[PDB]
Amino acid sequence: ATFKVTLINEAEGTKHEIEVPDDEYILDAAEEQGYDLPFSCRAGACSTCAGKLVSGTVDQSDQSFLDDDQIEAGYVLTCVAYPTSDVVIQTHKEEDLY
Numbered sequence: 001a002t003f004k005v006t007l008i009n010e011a012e013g014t015k016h017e018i019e020v021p022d023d024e025y026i027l028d029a030a031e032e033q034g035y036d037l038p039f040s041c042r043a044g045a046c047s048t049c050a051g052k053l054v055s056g057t058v059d060q061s062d063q064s065f066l067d068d069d070q071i072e073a074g075y076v077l078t079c080v081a082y083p084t085s086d087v088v089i090q091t092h093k094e095e096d097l098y
């Protein structure tokens with residue numbers, strides 16, 4: 001499968017659509033399609049690439065930084081997240097975490 005991922009940057013007022021293989025991380029596909037996004041470790045072990053789901057699902061089992069509550073709230077580490085449906089996700093959400 002190849003899923004539609006809509007990237008929303010709320011502070012900048014942008015909406016960007018990409019197509020993401022079910023076996024590619026969101027961050028890599030965004031970059032390839034011309035949308036650079038924040039990151040640092042690229043390994044699921046920081047908060048730099050955090051996003052927050054609006055709709056749809058991911059498999060971010062490779063992640064380690066987020067706690068279960070944060071995941072429940074919809075936070076995703078985009079560097080290690082595979083889409084498992086069409087997704088709408090807010091980017092640039094690191095500052096929401098504590």
Ligand code: FES
Pocket residue numbers: 038039040041042043044045046047048049050065077078079080
């Ligand atoms: S860039 Fe560190 S968890 Fe994604």
